[PDB]
Every structure is written in C-alpha cells, then in structure tokens.
C-alpha cells in the first residue's frame, strides 16, 4: 500500500481561470522550481497516484473446505496417473510405477547424498539433472526483491 | 605520549604538574602554527590527546575521592547519587511495591497458590 497522503502533503490550490494556465492545483509561494507547479492529481509530477492502493484490498480468499479437499484428492489422483505426470513436465519415462511407493527405510535417510543416490537408482537421475540445470536468474525486477533464482519443481 | 596505566599510580600534584607542562607545550605549538611554520604542526594533536588523557585520569581520581568521602550517610550530592531516568527514581522500590497489608500477607502465607498435578 502507498502511504496515505502521498502526493497530497502539499498546500496547493488552483490559481483559477484568468492566468492563462490550466486549472490544476498549483504549489504556492516562490523561489523554488516547485513554486507554481501542478500539485496533486494523477496527471501531475509529484501527484498522488489514481486509486492509491490500500491495505484493505481483499488479499485472501475463503475457499470452501470441501472444495479444497476435493482439489487435494484430484491432485493425488493426478499424481497417480503416469500420462498426467508426464504432461506436468517430469522426466518420468524411466520409472516403472507412478503411484511410486518406497519402503519406510526412506524415512530414516540421514544424508542428502544418500537421498540423491536413491533417487538416481529409482530412475529420476534425469529429473535430478534437469533440476540442477534449471536454477536460473529471473527475468525482471523480481531480482531486486529476493526472488533471484527461478527453480523448476521436482 | 603517556598512556593512562602509567598515570593512575601518580599523585594528584604530580598529575597537575604534568598537565601544566603539556598545556605549555600545546601553547608553544599553537604559537608556532600562528607564525609561518608547518614543521611540528602535526605534533599538536598528540599533545592534545595526552592532555585529555591526563584530565580524565585526574577527574576519575577526584571522583573516587569524592565517593570515598560521601560513603553512605543517607543523603549525598546529586552527582554521586544514582543518576538514572527521573521516572525510575520517582518510582516505588520493588520492596515498597511488594509490601502487603497485614491481613493480605497472612492470607498469602496460609493459602499460597499450590502446585497440584491433575490425573
């Protein structure tokens, strides 16, 4: 949100008609370059933006619990289906079964290296490689806002 | 260039004497600067620092002496008193705050908030 009185902190008023100047509010006084300038109003340099953004915009959306549940279920189902998974972009051509289930021994893995090895063994070597490749620096101003890298979802 | 650890041991008169000498030296340097010189213009800074050090040492000694003089005795100079935010000074001491009307105290003693593990 923009700070509340942005562009409107001035005392400016319009000179009115008979001066051969548009009737935008003007900064008063003299001496500065700012004196006599178009003041508030979306058009003006140093003006307020149009509908200044406010904290009371609706940020979240309530989604029906049931709907959410349904969505979750459908995603699970999708994860099930090989073709869908493939479409979603994963390099899954070398995995046998796509409801891919692994023994509880996995829950005790202590070392990232071991995990990686396991993944490779499974058939996801290619996927892993892709993931490694695809850390790249974002286009645009995300770069300036702690969104430096863009990484594909494994 | 005299650093403080040497000076702590010295007596006050000696310190004073030292200080005067330093001041004289400083004055000389200033005079030189005023006259068309830049030979020992940069010497002045060190001298100044030395003087400051001496002053600090002496001042702390004086403060210590003052403290010794006014040890306890209820009232004291407002310097040697506990300089501390005014509000805090005003505020009731924790003990005072605690102090309980006798009945209340009795009650507390008798029926204190017990520990009682529910099962």
């Amino acid at each position: 949100a923009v700070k509340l009185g942005a562009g409107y902190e001035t005392s400016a008023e319009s000179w009115g008609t008979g001066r051969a100047v548009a009737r935008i509010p003007r900064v008063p006084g003299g001496g500065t370059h700012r004196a006599g300038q178009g003041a508030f109003g979306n058009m003006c340099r140093g003006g307020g933006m149009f509908n200044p953004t406010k904290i009371w915009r609706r940020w979240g959306r309530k989604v029906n619990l049931k709907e959410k549940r349904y969505a979750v279920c459908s995603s699970i189902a999708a994860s099930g289906v090989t073709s869908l998974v493939l479409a979603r972009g994963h390099r899954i051509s070398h995995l046998k079964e796509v409801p891919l289930v692994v023994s509880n021994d996995i829950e005790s893995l202590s070392k990232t290296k071991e995990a990686v090895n396991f993944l490779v063994s499974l058939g996801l070597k290619d996927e892993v490689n892709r993931l490694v490749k695809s850390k790249k620096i974002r286009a645009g101003k995300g770069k300036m806002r702690n969104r430096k890298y863009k990484i594909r979802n494994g | 260039n005299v650093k403080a650890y040497e000076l702590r041991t010295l007596k006050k008169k000696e310190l004073l004497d030292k200080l005067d000498e330093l001041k004289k030296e400083l004055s000389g340097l200033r005079i030189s600067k005023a006259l068309g010189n830049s030979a020992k213009n940069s010497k002045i800074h060190g001298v100044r620092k030395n003087v400051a050090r001496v002053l600090t040492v002496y001042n702390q000694k004086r403060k210590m002496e003052l403290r010794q003089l006014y040890k306890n005795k209820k009232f004291k100079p407002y310097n040697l008193r506990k300089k501390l935010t005014k509000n805090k000074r005003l505020q009731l001491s924790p003990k005072q705050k605690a102090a309980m009307t006798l009945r209340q105290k009795k009650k507390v003693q008798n029926f204190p908030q017990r520990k009682y593990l529910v099962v």
């Binding site: 904290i55 940020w59 | 008798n110 029926f111 204190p112 017990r114 009682y116 593990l117 529910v118 099962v119």
Partner: protein, 161 residues
C-alpha cells in the same frame, strides 16, 4: 437509486477509512498466544493452566436446554464438596460469590463434579518432602514416588471441558 435492487443501507457516511482494522495478524497472533500459554504451562511445572468451572444452564428460553461452563462454584457447592472458598481458589477451582442455587439437582451435579476433580488431583507438597494434610478443603500431600508416577502419566484435561 435505480432499477429493482435492495434499497441501499451502507453506513459509510462518516470518515470510515480512519478506523478500518485489517486482521493481517490473525494466524500469527494465534501462534503467539499459543506460545505464551505453553510458556505459562512450563512455568507451572506439571500443574494445569486451566481452572475448574461448574457446568450451568444458560439463561433465556432459547438456550435453556443447553449447558456450559459458568465461572465459579458457589459457596454451597464448595461446602458440599467439603471445601473452603479460599482453599478452593488456591487449588485450581473457581469460586463465584454472586451465583446462587435454585435447583437441588444442579447443585448435586456440580458437587459431583467437584468430588471427581478432588479424586483426580494429587497435591505437590509446599516445602519438599514434608507431607502434611490440607486446610479446610485441600487433600493431603502425596509422597515422592507417587508424584513421580503421576508426572510420568499424562495430565488429563477432560474435566476442564
């Protein structure tokens, strides 16, 4: 106003923008509260944060049938339990000077509850080891082993609901 719509009723003719609170703090606030309560629990080693409340019937013809936790137990109920008010307060139980009993049955129920609570609870001694019997209401202090055993078991919070 135009067309067939509800006649507009929007109370925003005052400087409403001045006092809009948007609750960005909700979940985080909740978390903080939880943390605080945990801390409190820790401080009261073993003992429960929560205090015993009597079940009571809600007033008014419409909530009549429903029952919910009131504040505080009524002198009569305490007496029935075999308990002093001060003593009760000192333990985990709430006292309510202003509540009165019209119904015998209700009173009985709450004294039953109180009894149950008493049965449940085991009292840590005030000064260590030295086991002494209570004052007015409070039960006796158990020995060390028993206390340890109790600690090892789970602290039941079924009665406070």
């Amino acid at each position: 106003v135009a067309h067939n719509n509800v006649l507009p009723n929007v109370h925003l003719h005052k400087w409403w923008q001045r006092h809009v609170r948007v609750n960005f703090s909700k979940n985080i606030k909740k978390k903080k509260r939880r943390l605080l309560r945990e801390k409190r629990r820790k401080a009261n080693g073993g003992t429960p944060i929560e205090k015993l409340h009597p079940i009571v019937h809600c007033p008014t013809q419409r909530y009549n049938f429903r029952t919910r936790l009131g504040k505080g137990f009524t002198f009569e109920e305490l007496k029935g339990a075999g308990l002093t008010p001060r003593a009760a307060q000192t333990i985990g139980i709430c006292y309510d000077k202003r509540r009165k009993n019209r119904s015998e049955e209700s009173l009985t129920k709450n004294v039953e509850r109180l009894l149950k609570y008493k049965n449940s609870l085991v009292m840590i001694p005030l000064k260590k080891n030295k086991a002494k019997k209570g004052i007015g209401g409070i039960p006796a202090d158990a020995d060390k082993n028993t206390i340890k055993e109790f600690r090892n078991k789970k602290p039941l919070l079924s009665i406070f609901k």
